[PDB]
């Protein structure tokens, strides 16, 4: 069987010959009970770069050992791409949200042999699920693999926006000191109201990390948390996003991209936020209206915006989130720390092993069971 695997380019300096550190911590479980991925073996050392083309998610020796072929490419856009040229033949397709090979209805129809689509990461919005179901295709993602990584990025970005980190760092680089320049927009996070859209794996991890900062916590989720959890964290549940954002100094978005979240943060909802609110979005780019964010930063309605997720990806050179005032953006990286890569790579293998050995794929990994 042919496995077709789309990954991002190596670093422009070459695939790394060494790393800043010798190893990474062992993670073998997640809050709430779920175990870390359980492949029978891994053919990499946690901490290696796995998610770029030379890394191959550590899959080659395993797949070739079983008589399969593995095609790895970053070339994923259009009919002429290696991806589309190889797609009709592939039984299995794998990519990461950070560099996603879209399975549109058109691509799915062309993909005559496709039985399994794996998301190495979380969030399968790049796969047409209606089309997968129609064609009996199984769709899996590595649930929880990077949720914590994101939660860390979120808290980092909230503190960086509120405290005015990056502007202050720039004064250092520019050879200045300029205390008042740095702190005329520098606040403490303490005792601010912070709210999350969603309290799933990421959102709950964010709340737990925010708690000791002594903020007042708020959230909305279609699935309300147990009352006892609300009480332990000091959470206020709100019946809607709109109702929540009205009282928040800071809002972080941690819901998947789907009908109810597409363009959720448009001019109208942003206008309901407190003037000078901070908005953080490591969920998906399209949950926030591109130009509405820009307008709100320009007017001061938002004091700052930060996230790692864009529409489209990669963001073109002219993408206006690059030059809008008061941002702390990164490219789409939070879910692809080297730490996270070890887990979703192990998880991708665990899924492939279940597939080939005809064992059930873990229930929490399954998005459609074909």
In the chain, helix, strand, coil percent, each to 5?
35, 15, 50
Rounded distance between C-alpha atoms, residue 302 and residue 271, angstroms: 9
The only residue of 1, 2, 27, 237 in contact with its own copies, by rule CB under 8 A: 27
From 81-89, 166-174, 217-225, 355-363, span contacting ligand NAD (CB under 6 A): 217-225
Angle in degrees, CA 225, 229, 230, rounded to 5: 75
**Tokens at 299, concatenated:** 């007017």
Q: Which does 198 bind (CB under 5 to 8 A by kind): ligand NAD, its own copies, none?
A: ligand NAD
The only residue of 168, 196, 261, 281 in contact with its own copies, by rule CB under 8 A: 168
Asked whether position 213 contacts its own copies by CB under 8 A, the answer is: yes
Write phi, then psi, for 140 (nearest 5 degrees): -130, 150
Rounded distance between C-alpha atoms, residue 220 and residue 235, angstroms: 10
Asked whether position 123 contacts ligand NAD by CB under 6 A, the answer is: yes
The only residue of 132, 336, 352, 355 in contact with its own copies, by rule CB under 8 A: 336
Rounded distance between C-alpha atoms, residue 5 and residue 101, angstroms: 9
Asked whether position 73 contacts its own copies by CB under 8 A, the answer is: no
Question: What part of residues 286-345 is at the interface with ligand NAD (CB under 6 A)?
Answer: 308-309, 332, 334-335
Give the β-pairing of 138-141 and 366-368: antiparallel
CA 165 to chain centre: 23
Counted residue by residue, the chain has a size of 370
Asked whether position 77 contacts its own copies by CB under 8 A, the answer is: no
Question: What part of residues 228-287 is at the interface with its own copies (CB under 8 A)?
Answer: 249, 274-276
To the question of whether residue 193 is assigned a binding role by annotation, the answer is: no
State in angstroms the smallest separation of the CB of 222 from ligand NAD.
4
Q: What's the half-sphere exposure (Cβ side, CA atoms, 13 Å) at 172? A: 5
**Tokens at 111, concatenated:** 């993909």
Q: What's the half-sphere exposure (Cβ side, CA atoms, 13 Å) at 95? A: 23
Give the β-pairing of 92-95 and 2-6: parallel
To the question of whether residue 218 is assigned a binding role by annotation, the answer is: no
To the question of whether residue 146 is assigned a binding role by annotation, the answer is: yes
The only residue of 107, 193, 284, 343 in contact with ligand NAD, by rule CB under 6 A: 284
Q: Which of 193, 327, 332, 349 is catalytic?
A: 332
Give catalytic status of residue 146 as yes or no.
Answer: yes
Q: Which does 320 bind (CB under 5 to 8 A by kind): ligand NAD, its own copies, none?
A: none
Query: What residue ranges bind ligand NAD (CB under 6 A)?
Result: 121-123, 146-147, 150, 197-203, 220-223, 254-257, 260-261, 282-284, 308-309, 332, 334-335
Catalytic residues: 146, 284, 313, 332
């Amino acid at each position: 069987a042919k496995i077709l695997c789309v990954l991002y380019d190596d670093p422009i300096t070459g695939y790394p010959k060494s790393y800043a550190r010798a190893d990474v911590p062992k993670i073998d479980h997640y809050p709430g009970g779920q175990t870390a991925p359980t492949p029978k073996q891994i053919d990499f050392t946690p901490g290696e770069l796995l998610g770029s083309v030379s890394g191959e998610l550590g899959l080659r020796k395993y797949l070739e050992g079983l008589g399969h072929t593995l095609v790895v490419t970053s070339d994923k856009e259009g009919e002429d791409s290696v991806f589309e040229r190889e797609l009709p033949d592939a039984e299995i397709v794998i990519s990461q949200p950070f560099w996603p090979a879209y399975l549109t209805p058109e691509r799915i129809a062309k993909a005559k042999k496709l039985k399994l689509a794996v998301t190495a990461g979380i969030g399968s919005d790049h796969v047409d699920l209606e089309a997968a179901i129609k064609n009996g295709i199984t769709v899996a993602e590595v649930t929880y693999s990077n949720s914590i990584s994101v939660s860390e990025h979120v808290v980092m970005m909230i503190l960086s926006l509120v405290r005015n980190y990056i502007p202050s760092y720039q004064w250092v680089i520019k050879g200045g000191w300029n205390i008042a320049d740095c702190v005329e927009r520098s606040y403490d996070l303490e005792a601010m109201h912070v709210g999350t859209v969603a309290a799933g794996r990421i959102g709950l991890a964010v709340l737990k990390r925010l708690k000791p900062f002594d903020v007042k916590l708020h959230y909305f989720d279609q699935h309300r948390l147990p009352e006892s959890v609300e009480n332990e964290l000091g959470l206020t549940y709100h019946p809607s996003v709109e109702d929540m954002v009205k009282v928040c100094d800071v809002v972080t978005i941690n819901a998947p991209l789907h009908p109810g979240t597409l363009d959720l943060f448009n001019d109208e909802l942003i206008s309901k936020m407190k003037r000078g609110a901070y908005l953080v979005n490591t969920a998906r780019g399209k949950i926030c209206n591109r130009d509405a964010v820009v307008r709100a930063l320009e007017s001061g309605q938002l004091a700052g915006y930060a996230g790692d997720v864009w529409f489209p990806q990669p963001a073109p050179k002219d993408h206006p989130w690059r030059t809008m005032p008061h941002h702390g953006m990164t490219p789409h990286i939070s879910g692809t720390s080297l730490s996270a890569q070890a887990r979703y790579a192990a998880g991708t293998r665990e899924i492939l092993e279940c597939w080939f050995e005809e064992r059930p794929i873990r229930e929490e990994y399954l998005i459609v069971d074909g």
